[PDB]
Structures are given as structure tokens and as C-alpha cells.
UniProtKB/Swiss-Prot annotation:
Residues 370-500 are annotated as: Helical bundle R2. The modification Phosphotyrosine is found at Y830. This is Talin-1. Residues 627-758 are annotated as: Helical bundle R4. Residues 1072-1167 are annotated as: Helical bundle R7A. Residues 1041-1662 are annotated as: Interaction with SYNM. Changing T615I: Reduces stability and binding to VCL with little effect on binding to APBB1IP. The chain holds residues 208 to 2291 of 2541 of the full protein. Residues 1537-1687 are annotated as: Helical bundle R10.
Amino acid sequence: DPVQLNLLYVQARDDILNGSHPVSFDKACEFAGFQCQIQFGPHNEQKHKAGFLDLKDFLPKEYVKQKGERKIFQAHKNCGQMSEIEAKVRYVKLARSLKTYGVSFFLVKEKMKGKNKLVPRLLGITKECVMRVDEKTKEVIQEWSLTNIKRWAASPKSFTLDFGDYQDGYYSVQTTEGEQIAQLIAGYIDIILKKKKSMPPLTSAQQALTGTINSSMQAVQAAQATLDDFETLPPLGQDAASKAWRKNKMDESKHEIHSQVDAITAGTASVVNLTAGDPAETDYTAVGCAVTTISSNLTEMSRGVKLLAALLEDEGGNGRPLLQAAKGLAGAVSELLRSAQPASAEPRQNLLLAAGNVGQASGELLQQIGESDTDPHFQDVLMQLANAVASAAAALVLKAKSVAQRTEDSGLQTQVIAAATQCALSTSQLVACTKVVAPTISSPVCQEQLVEAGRLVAKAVEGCVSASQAATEDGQLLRGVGAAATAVTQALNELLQHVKAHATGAGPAGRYDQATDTILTVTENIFSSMGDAGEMVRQARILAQATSDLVNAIKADAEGESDLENSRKLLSAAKILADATAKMVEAAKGAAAHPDSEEQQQRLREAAEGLRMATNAAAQNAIKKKLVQRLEHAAKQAAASATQTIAAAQHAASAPKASAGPQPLLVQSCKAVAEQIPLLVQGVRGSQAQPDSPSAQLALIAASQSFLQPGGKMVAAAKASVPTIQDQASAMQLSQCAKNLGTALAELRTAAQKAQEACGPLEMDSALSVVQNLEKDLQEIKAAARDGKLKPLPGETMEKCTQDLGNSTKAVSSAIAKLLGEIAQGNENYAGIAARDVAGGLRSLAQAARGVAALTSDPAVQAIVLDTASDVLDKASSLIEEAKKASGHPGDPESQQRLAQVAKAVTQALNRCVSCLPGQRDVDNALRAVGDASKRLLSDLLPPSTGTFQEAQSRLNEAAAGLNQAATELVQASRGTPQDLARASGRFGQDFSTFLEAGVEMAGQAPSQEDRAQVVSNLKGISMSSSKLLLAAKALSTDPASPNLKSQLAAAARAVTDSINQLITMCTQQAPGQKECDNALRQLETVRELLENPVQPINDMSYFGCLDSVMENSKVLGEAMTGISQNAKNGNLPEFGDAIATASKALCGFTEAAAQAAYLVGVSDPNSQAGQQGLVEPTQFARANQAIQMACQSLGEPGCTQAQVLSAATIVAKHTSALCNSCRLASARTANPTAKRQFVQSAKEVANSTANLVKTIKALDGDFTEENRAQCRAATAPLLEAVDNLSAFASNPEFSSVPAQISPEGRAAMEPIVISAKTMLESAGGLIQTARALAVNPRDPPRWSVLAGHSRTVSDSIKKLITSMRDKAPGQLECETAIAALNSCLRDLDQASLAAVSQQLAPREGISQEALHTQMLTAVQEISHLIEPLASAARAEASQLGHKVSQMAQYFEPLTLAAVGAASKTLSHPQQMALLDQTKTLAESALQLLYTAKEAGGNPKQAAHTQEALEEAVQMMTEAVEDLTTTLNEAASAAGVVGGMVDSITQAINQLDEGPMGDPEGSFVDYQTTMVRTAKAIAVTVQEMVTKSNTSPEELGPLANQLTSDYGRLASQAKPAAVAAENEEIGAHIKHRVQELGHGCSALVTKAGALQCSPSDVYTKKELIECARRVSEKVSHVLAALQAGNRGTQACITAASAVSGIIADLDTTIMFATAGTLNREGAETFADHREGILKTAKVLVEDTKVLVQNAAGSQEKLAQAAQSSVATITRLADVVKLGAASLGAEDPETQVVLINAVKDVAKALGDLISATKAAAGKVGDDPAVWQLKNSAKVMVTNVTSLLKTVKAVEDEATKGTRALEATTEHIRQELAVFCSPEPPAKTSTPEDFIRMTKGITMATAKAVAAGNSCRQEDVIATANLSRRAIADMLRACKEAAFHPEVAPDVRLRALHYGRECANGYLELLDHVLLTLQKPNPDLKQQLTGHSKRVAGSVTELIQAAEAMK
């Protein structure tokens, strides 16, 4: 039956056509062809064209718009004319052919694995299969059987399905129809199952709190026990330095106990605050954090007080009271922790009583210590204020109780009663927290706790107000309102008193306390607002008022005082103030007169500084002192926070005791800061004790600035350790301490900077006094030595004293080099810094010398070390004196020469002081033996005896073997006792004497004089290398454990054996033919000794690099061993020798590569850490130096031949070029600005001397003039002096290195390479000896057998070493481990999401959601910090790669845990799914990055595609991290909590201050404009925050988040702008102002968060308003500092924005005039406005030409140019609006064309402004200036168009002419805009495209109509309308062009179509102009054809716009 077949065809056609069956384009085309065969019959070639075949019912509606109609037509022509029933059967057969037929299909948006994006996938459901299906190919991309599904999951937004068995991971896809998908697949699964035939009960959070508190109480008891015993102290003696040690340790212990009692009081306050909530609501882990803070700081306090008690009991004072106080505190703490236990059922009053007891106990303890400076009057005030608040709250409770008595309704009454009880409870809690916090009120964290209690009590008061309002409008409501007002006012008074005592300068105030403070603040503002005339002059005027008031007051007080002399002095001070104010006012007037002249602004700033200086003398120097006390408060807070962080880190890292992870790095940083703290405390105390001593203030500033760096490192390490720590309470405590340390460090930066400007320059007068005090102290040490009682300080061991003495001498020499460099740069204050560094190094040297004297027992040793140290100190005192005399007055060559002589003297003294140390011995004796032997070689070489030339030559060869032996003995002894190396050095000296005796014998015994030159040169070289070797041995002697010194010694041994080889190759005759084998074996021995101990790299080239080098050198060794074997077979001497030499060079290269590979494998072990490799590579530096001295010595010898002269010149050029390169790299690598400056200066000086020497030697090449040779000799010296200055400077131990610390298992994995290479070297030495024998005897069987054996042993060792190198391959085992870990985290997240679908996820009850989000955000921050270095390692090196992958894994596990928690807590299912999905995206992107990094593996040979995969993985990871960070930040800012906002701002400040500098990409101007944009954005954000505070306070959150992210953007670009500015003062100012604004923003955001959490508080709103005012002032200051950039111009940005505002005004006028609102006023004519326009336009073109001529030059003239240009354009716009008014609204199109003309003129001026900005002070031939003139031409064209338009719009005769030509000009510039490819800001959708295309159709219809009409009215109307339409169309098309989601092909097609349309309309416009000109009736008829081409262009534009979406 064919009917059923037709019905099957019907169903198939229905399914395919309607779109309910997934089918791709092609098989749809064949099904359409079958449709043609059925219902259109056989195809006819020409009858089946396009246009008639309706496609809607003929192809699937989803694919009809594919518009491949032609393809369909030839498919039809192909289908044939064959019968139709077979068409039906083929239709049904092809229907059943597809896998996609007969089953349901759903479009479900799927998330691609790795991105936060979505792609539709047509999921299908089958009786047998579940298959994903791509939308565009409609073919199965992946398949799943039903029988494997276990639990699907339906949600109204998503449908998640699982498999478990097949693929680890589940199927997540979101869709609106999840419910029916799930129920449908449920039924299909059911049929497959059918087919088979057969509160005393504590919560877990409370349990964890109980555990933490029990452990803490155990620690409290075990710390209470240790108190009873005085600890001990090491014997110290009455040494003056030891007395200072005792006092310093006493002071440090006092400060430390103060910090921990601060921490204990804050912890108890926090316990009170947190436990106040209802149970089952408290943040229990925060309570645990508080108890751990208490107990940890208690144990450290017990240690501190034991030490302090011992130190006191040495003095008369008794330690029993202090022990009693500490034991009382410990008992109070133990009782509190007894009360805080959740299981206890005591009333809350017990806990509050315990907290009060802790407060009083800590107060008593602080009284005993002698540190509670907080005056007892202030504690009295606090207590009476808190009691006043309690009384007022009691009164409010009375009123509330009365109201509850009056009211009647049940339920309401209990609400009122509950509110009253809450008020009473919260005020009692506030009183008790005040009791707790009173003794330790300086600590900010205590104050935060107390303001938290205050916020709680205010919230309860507002609750009481609401409860009163529940009543009914009685006078009792008025009384309740009154009671609330007193309670809030009383709380504010306590909070205000509180904040006042937060930062109190001191007890006494002084008589000018307030006036001086105000002038300080206003001068600070004047300094801050550099480069802004208005702010400067306003601040100058307010300053003048304040200081005039101060002068009046001081004059009145001078009248009051009675003594004639004192009154005269005070009146003179008043006179000085008045004079300074008069000069400042004059400077301000001058600045205001010429606002944009930087000279006047500099004069005003200098006048303000002079006023400050006068004030410091007019009164007691309060301003300097005031800034000093602010710094002291900041430094005390920083030290206290550092101690708290150290305590937290120690307590947290003890439990896991993991040698991996970030704890060991944290421990090293903690130790560094713990040795840095006492210096800060000592400086603070020195400044506290001496207020008027400038040296103490400078020492304090220096101590704080030094503390800044290690503090930042601890902060970073602590932030990195938090996610790893398993103890949540310890983790939170460490996190809080890290945040507080960061804040304190930022404020320390700001305060230290402020003081450094405050205190004058160091003047290098303090350094002289410091070295003088060192001399006097050392004299007293000498006196004590004469007493025979000089004792060692407790920490000093004689070996450590030696090491520190060596380091101090090197640092002193480096700082002397700095000082000479700075003086040579001329009269610098940096010379003061250099003098300070010299003095510091000298203090360290004196300390080490005293220690060395104390440890040693011989009186003569003590006397001699004291003598040499005092000599060093006095020589350096003379050096400092000469430095002062030099920096006083520049321009004196005698100054530089005398400074050089004194530096030489002090360096010699330093070397004596090192050598004077009797520990190292016989190194000086051996060095002197070398020197004396060299000098006896030096002169009159004449052979004393001929002897036997050849036999004594053999003797010389034996002496060479002996010298090699002795050098190998040195390099071996370098791993033994210092006595071993000393005796080895002596033996080497004796052997060198023997060898040089043989050398001097053959010096004269050689007949020819050419050989005499050879021997003398080679002997000088050998002597110099030996001297360097002995100096390296000396360096080892003074410091035995350092591995860099050991590697230097091995390198020196290599150099000496190399020089031996050079001498034997050159001078000794080649007659034996075996000397090259001798040199071979020498090098073999030396390089084996290099191989023996791989702990530092002897090379830079990395692991896979050294594998490549091993491959290459194994190839060379193979070819050379074949060569030597065959040449021994053939007995050919010269090539045999050459092949042996090549084999030996290959062996040496191989052993260098294997040593480096061993070192790399050792470092790559997880436990081991690497080092920073120092600045200048030591071995290369030494080689370059020695080459330079050798070349200059070659130039030094009198007989100058051309060959040697040119060789020396080339060698010097090459080596000094490499040296300057190294200096530049070092200056680009270091962080000390002085280091950068001096490295650059040294590079400049060495380059200058190199150029001088090169020019002199080029004047010498080919001339040989004796006077020219003398000139060369004279110029030789400065190069050596410069390279010596560089060697001295770059020897600073700070630059040197940090030895890599190798794990023991690291050495275990290191050994195999060393073993195999040692065996190979032994085999190769044997082979060399056998080959020498073969050279002796031509043939012998056993010898050839052993030669083959040695060659095969070499080969086997090579193969084994290669096997080990390839099999280890560091960085691909821990990558596998990390990948497994990340996949486990993926499974955990996927299972959590699956649980969360069907609503089974259990919200953990312990911790608050905010803390979970903070946990997630810290983990995300760490992963974000790690991403980039992981990529960098995956590109270059392997060891760092392994470390990075391990770190990323350890961070990715706790992030998963916290994400599960925070998703569980959230209730809104879409939000929790968002968190789970973004976290899963981050995990997936990390997994992909680890895959691609294990692929690349740090192999530079990796394919380009793997590098591309790595880069795209990194970009995916960065995107995922930023997406998750934004989700978390927004979700945390929706709630009022502000945490991670102030954290991010302080972190951004810190990141701004530190980091790497490189002079980055980009100029200054682009950074300036972007960052001025950001500054404007933050200013308008804070203003919006101000308005939203009053209006609607729930909008404070998102605004705060926006402000924090904007400040992060501002501070990310601040450092590159700072380092890119043409002057460093400018960049410094920008950095300082950005940091100060950071402080302001942190404060403002804290206030905004507080207000959003307490919306109705009258006072926090106030403080928010003043914080916003302050941050607005800071934004004004940073904008002003950005205006100080001459390059470009801030005037250009302001001009661009002003003309943009003008354009906005003109567009508004377009709107008004088009609406017809713009009407005539009176009888205003148009002609007068026309002359106005003409004048203004001529002035505008003059402004344009003056701008183009002024574009290159100072900022001033360009500023007037731009300002005048903007003034002229706005005046022109105003007169244009007036003229448009004069034209009346009756003809709006004329006004529209006028405004469009002036508006495009404004656009041209804006483009001209941008062009002028891009070309400021450039060369004449830069492309920017050509672009500028192009812009000027465009501006001229536009203004001429305006001129002609007005000139002939006076009359209507030429309306159409001008309108039409203006329109064609504007379309021409539109197509010109298309000529330049740039992306439009917006990207529009095709709906606007259809709109604009319909507009074009209407415009062209009206164009044809107007052309027919030839009437000016419709012509100008068409001109305007079509101009706007076409311009807007092209704008939207370009918006769609650079839009990434639009494919490049269709964007190009759309550009083609738009260009065609624009052209066609342009020729249409020229044709309408032709139609207007001549009557042209045929041309008017032709316009129709132009319209037809326009319509075709419109059609293709419709196609292009419809194509995309």
C-alpha cells in the first residue's frame, strides 16, 4: 500500500519542516530535494529558478534563514526526474538513517568546561540513549546509555544528571524546562528497569570551641607554672656594650609584654562581644580565634616577663611584684576561659565579671612593667562616661517599662519588655567591655571591639524606640524619644573621647598647640597640591589667616612676658613669622597671576616650606616634633602588630610541623622580622627620650624605613599561609594579624615619608658623630681590655664574629663606593644616605671587632684587633670629613682626587682589619710569597744559569704538575676545617715558588726573545691567577660555610689550571707531543673537583639547557675519542693532539653541565628552596675583570706591537661592553634607589673610560708614536679605577646572593648524576694516560684493549647519566599529584552541586557566611598570585614549575571546602549555584593549565602549539579568577560587611610601594590620561556616596565596592606612571598622593559600611560625610599631582572633556530646535550674528595655528593655547545658538544645519586636541606632527564650511547648495573615519540596524523627491535628514564591525556594503548638486538610477545586518 508510505512521508516532512527534528543544513537540503520531487515533481532547469520556490514550508524554519538557496536549487537539479514513490521510500530511509530520529530533543544551555560561558546543546532522550547534540552540526558529539544513570536532578533553572561509573563527574546543564526533562527521562529509565525481569547536647561547632578552649586553658596553666622560676641569663659582665645589651633587651621585653597584654585585652573584649548573641547564632570559630589569641599571647607574655624579671633582679629592683602581677593575669585569664566554655550554664554576669577582672589584672601588670602611659585621668573619664551611658540607658528602660505598663495589646507588650531588657543587657555589656579595654586603649583592635559594643547598644536603643512607637501617640512616646537622645549622645561622648585618645600626641599641649597644628595641615595641603594654582592659592590664603593669628598671639605673649631679653627674642620670632608670611603671600599672588607657570608654583611651595622652617624657630619646633610623634605612634603600632603576628605564626605553625608548603618560608620571614623589631623599638625609645636630638629622629626614620621591607615579606607569607593551615581558629588569628600588620605598615610608610620631608636633610653631619661615638666606644673597649675584663655578648660566637666582620668590611667598601659616586654626581643629599650606610657598616665592623676581641684570650690579639679597628674608624672619620667638604662645593678636581686617595686608605685599612684577624692564617703569607716571587720575576730577566735546557724543561713540567696538585689540594680543603685550608694555602704558596722558579729559569734560558716575551706574559698571567686564587681562599677562611665563596674558589682553581695550560701550550716546545695531554689531565682533575659538591649553580643555563649541552658535548666527546684512537693507530701527532684538546674541552663542558644538572635536581625537590642568584654573576664578573687587567697589562708593557695592541683593544671593548650590560641589568633588578643610581653611574663611568681608551688606541693603531703610547699608558689607569670601583660596589653582601637550601631527600635524588659523572671522569683520565702511552709506543695489544675498555666505560657513563637526566625530568611528578588533587576537588564540587539541586545540602551551623566568603576570597587571591609564575616556569625552568604546581594544589583544596560551605549557607538557589559553578570553573581552568604545563614542562624546545595552549589556559584562568572575585565581592557588598575592601586598599597601597621596576612600555601621557579618568571616576563615586547616604543608605555597599576596585585600578597604574615620568620627583609625588588617597578611601569605605549596617545613626552618617570630604580633597591632590606632568598636558584632557561637553550642549540645542522650542526673542537680526560668527571663526583659526605652532615646547604656552581654543569654541557655540534663535523656529531645518555645522566643527577641534596631545615636545620628523597637521587641515576645512554656510545662509538663494555640500563633506569625513580602523565604544544589535536601514530608504526617497522639486526647503530638509541617517548608520555598522561576536567574514561584507551605499549616495549627492546647477532635466531623470543602486546597497546592507545578532 502506497498510502501508508505517503503517510510516513507526511510525518517525516512535518518533523523536518517545523524544526522539531534536529537536522543540519545538508541533509535538510536533500530532504528538500525529495520534497521537490514529490510536490513539485520533476525539476526543470530554467523553470526552477530562485524567487518562486517558497522555502518556509520547504526547509526547517531554523535553517531557512541560512539562505543557501542556490545550493538547494542545484541539489534539486541533481535529484533527477525519477519516480515519486521511490522518493517517498528514500525519504523514510534517510529519516531512519540518522541517529537523531524518533526521539525527543530539548535545547538546553550548557556550560563549557573551563569558562563562564554558555553554548546550546540539543540534549536528546531515547528509549536506549541519552546524547548531547551540537546545534550547528546536529550530530552526536557524545553518547550515554540510560542503564548507567543513578540519580538525575531537576530544578526550575537547571537539570543536573550523573553517571558515576563511566565518567568521573556529572552532567550539569541549565534550562527553564528542567522539570519535564527530568520526569520524561525518569519514565524512560523506569521502562529499562521494567524490561529486566526478576542545651547539654552540644553542636559540633560548640564541640570544636570546647576543644580549642580546653587546649588553650592547658597552655594557660602550663604557662602559669613556668612563672614561679626566674629563668636564667648568660653571663655578660660590666662591658659598656653589654650594659647597652641588658638595657635593650629590657626595653624590648617591656614592649613585647605590652603588645601581648594588648592582645589579651582585645581577645577578651572580642569574646564578650561575640558571645553576646543567642546560641545557635554566634560565630563560633571567631570565639575560638579569640581564645587562641588570648592563650598564645599569654604564653609569649610569660616568656617575656620571665626574661624581664631576671634582667630586673640583676639590678636592685625586685622581680617578685612583676611575677605576682603576671600570675594574677594568668589566673584571671584561666578563670575567664573557664567561664567562656559553651557547656557551662552560668549566668552571663559571671563572664562579664571575669572579663572585668582580666581588664584590671592587665592594668596592674602594665603598671608594674612601666608602660601604661595612658593617663589615669583618662581611665577615670572612660569609667565615668561608661557609667553615664549606663545611667541614661537605665532611664530609657524606665520610660520603656512605663510605656509597656500603659499599653494593652498582648504581644506588643512583650515586644516592648524585650526591647527594654535588650537595652539594659547591651549597656551593661558596653560598660564591661570598657572595663576590659581601658588599660590598653592605644591599641586599635581594642577600640574596634569597643565601638562594636557601642554599635550593639545603639541598635538596642533604636529597637527600644521602635517598641515605643508600637504604642499609640502619647506623651510617653515623647519621653522615650528624649531618653533615646540622651543615651545616643552619651554613647557618642564616650566614642569621641575614645577616638581622641586613639591618637594623642602627648600629655602636655603647649601654648601654640592648635595654631601650629593648623599651619602644619595647611602647609601639608599646599605641598600636596603641586601643579594646581587654585588649590594652592586658596590654601595659601587660609594659611595666611591662621599664621597671622599666630603672629598676633605671639606678639601679645611677648607683651605679657617680663624679661627684656626673652620678650625681645619672642618678638624677633614674631617678626620672622611675619616676614615669611609676607613672602608667601607675594608668592601666592604671583602664582595666581600666572596660574600655568611652574616657576611660580615652585616659588609658592618653597615659600610654604620656608614658612614651616620659620615657625619651627618662631615657636618650639612643634611641626617637626608633631610629625615625629605621629611617626613614633605609627612605628609603635607597627612593632606591636609585628610581634602579634609573630606570636600567631609561631602558635599556628607548631601544630602541623610540615617542612613543605609556605610555613618554612613564613618561618624564615618571621625570624627576619623578629631580628628587625628590636632595632625599631630601640630607635623609637631613642627618639622618645631625646625630643630635641636630630640624630635620634633620623635614626628612627631609617629604622622604620628598614623595617618596611621584611614586614611586607612577612605580610605576604602570612597571607599565603592562611588557606593551608588546618586549624581554623589559628588561621583566622593569623589572617587578622596579617591584616593589622599590613595596615600598620602602610601607615608607617606614610608617617615615615611625612617625617622625612619634615626633618631636614641628613647633611652627613650625623654620620661623622656616629663614627666619632664608635671611636670613643672602641676606646672604652680598649680600656676594658687593659682591665683584662672584656666579655662576649650572649649571642656571639667567634666564628660568627669573623663572618660578620668580613661582611661588614665588604659593606663598608661598597658604601664608600656609593659615597664617591654620589659626590661625583655633585652635591647630593644622596651623599647623606651614602654616609649613613658607611656609618652603619662601620658600626657593624666595630661590633664584630669587639666580639672578636672578647672571644680571644691572648692580650696581643685583642690589642692588635682593637688597634686596626680604631685605625679603620679614624680613617673613615677623615673620609667623612672630606666627603662633607666636597659635597659643600662642587667643581674641584682636587676634591675628587683627594677623595680617591682617602678611599684607597680606608680600603687598605679594611683589608688590614680582615687580615689582622688571627683566625685565618698563612693565606696572607702565601699571598705575599706569590707577590714577592712575581716581583723577582718582574725586572731585568737574565738567566742566572743555563744548566740543561731540555732536562730542566722536564723539571718545569714536573713543577707544573705539582702546582696543579696544590691547587687541587686547596679546592679539596675548601670542604674541611679552616686549619686545613690555611695549611693547604701555605703548601700551594711554596709549590708556586718552585714552579715560578722553573718559569723564571726558562724566562732567560729560551734563546729567542719572542719566546722571552711569551714566557714573561704567561708568567704574569699565572701569577695573577694564583693571586686571585689565594684571595678566594682568604674569603673562604673568613667564612667557611658560604657556598658562593666555595664556588668562587673552584672557579679560581679552574683559572689557574687554565693559565698553566696556556703557558705550556705557548712556551714549551712541542717536541714530546704529549704536553696537550698533560694539560688535558690537569683540567680533568680541576673539573672533577668542581663536580664534587653540587650546592650552588656554576652556571645559569637551565635544566633542559644542560641536558642539551650534555648531548652536544657527548657528541663532541664521541667524535674526539674516535679521532684520538684513529690518530694513535696512524701515529699522526698534531691532529692527535688537537683531538685530545677537543676531547678535554668537551669533558669540561660536560662536567659543568652535569654539575649544574645535579644542582637543579637538588633544588627541584619539594622541601628544598632556591635563591635569588644575586645581581652580578660572580664567576663571569671575575673572568671579565681579570681579562680587563690582563689586556691593560699587555698595553702596559713598553714594547707595543700592532697585533697585541689591537687584540687588547678588542678584548677591552668586548669585556667592558658586557660589563656595562651587566650593570644595566643589575640596576634594572635591584630595589634600592641608591643601588640603581650608583649602578647606572658606574656603568656610565666605565663606558666613558672605555670610550676614551678606545679613541686613544685608535689614534695609536698603525702609528706607534712614543708620545701616543704614553697617552695610552696614561689613559689606561682610569679604566682600571672604574672597574675597581664597580668591583668594590657590587661586592656588597646585600647584593651577593642567598645560598640555596637543599633538602636531604634532595641530595638523595641528586647523587646518581654525581656518581656516574665521577666514574666517567676517572675512566677518561685513564683513557688519556693510555693514549699518551700509545703516543709513546705505536702499537701494543693490552694497551689497545684497555683503550677500548676506557672508551666504552666513558660511553656507558654518558648513557647512564643521560638516562637519569631524562627519567628524572623535574616538574612532571608533582604535576601528576596536583592534577589528581584538582580532579578530586572537581568531584567534590560536582557532588556538592548535585546535592544542592534536590535540596539536600546541609548548611553548616558553626561559622558565619561572611567568614566563609573571606576564606574563599583569600584562597582565590593566592591562586591568582600563583597563576602567572606557574606559566613563567612552564616556559623557562622546571624546578620552579614543580614548586608552583604544588602550591596551586594546596591552595585549591581549602577553596573547594570553603566554597561548599558558603554555597550551603546561602538560601537563594540561583546564588548558591552561581558560587558552586564559578568555583568549579576555576578548578577546571586550573586543571587545564596543569595539563598544558606538564606538556610544556619548561622545555624551550616545545612546539608552538603547546605554548599557545599554555597561553590560552593562562587567560582562561585569569578570567575565571576575576569572575569569581567579582561574584564574591558583590555578594559580600550587598550585605553591609566591609572586609576585603579596606584590606584590598591597604594591600594595593603596599603593592604600589614595592615591586620590580623596568621602565615599562608606554609613554607618560597615556598613563596620565587613563589615570586621570580613574581619579575623576572615584571623585564622582564619593560624591554619589555622599548623596546616597542621606537618600537611600542601602546603596552604600555597591558604591563602596566600586570605589575600592577603582582605587585598585588607580594604584595598579601608579607605579608604571611613576617610573615612566621624565623626572623622579614627579613619580614620587604621584606615588605618595595615591597612597594617601588610599588611606582616605580605606577610612571612607569603613565608615560607609558602618553606616549601611546602622542606617539611622545620626553620627556615623556625619563621620561618613567628613570622610567623604577628606577623600575628595585627596582626589583633588592626586589630580593636581597628575597635572604636574609636562609631557602631553592635563590641559589637553580638560580641553577634550570641555569640547565634549560643548558637543553635548549642541546636541541638546539640536533637540530643542527640532522640537521647535528654540524660538526668536524680540527682533534680533541675523546679519549682526553673522559678523560675530566671522570674527569668532577667524579667531578660532588663529587659535588653531597658534596651537600647532606651540605643540612642541613647555607646558605653559600649550596650556594657554588649549585654554584659549576652548574659550573661543564655547563663545562660538554661544553666538551660534544666539543666531539660531535669531533664525526662528518657523524654519527649523536651517537651525539644524547650522548646529550640525558647528557641532562637527567642535568634533574636528576635539580630534585636533587629541592630536596635539599625542605630539607634545617631539622631534620635527615624528609621525605624530604629520598627524597633527592633518588634523589642523581637517579643522580648517570644517571651519571654512561653517563660514561659507553662514555667509550664504543670510539669504535663501543658496540654502540647498550649502546644505548639500555640508552633507557631502560630513559623509566624506564619515568614510574617512572608516578609512582608519578603530573600534567604536559601543556594539549595537541588528534591530537598530533594520531601523537605520529603513531610515536610509526613507531618506533616499525624500532625496529623489527633493531633487525633483528643486525647492530649497525640501532640499535642505533632505540634506539634514539623510546626513544624520547615513552618519548614524555608518556609526552603528562600525559598532558592529569591531564587535568580537560578529564573525570577520560578515563584518568585512558589511563594511563592503556600507562603503558601497555611502559611495552611491555620495555620487547621488554630487548628482543632486548637478541637478540644482544646470536645469539638467535628463540628469534629474538619471537620479532614479542612482536611487536604484542605493536601493541595491540597502538590500545588501539588510542581508549583512540580518546575518549576525
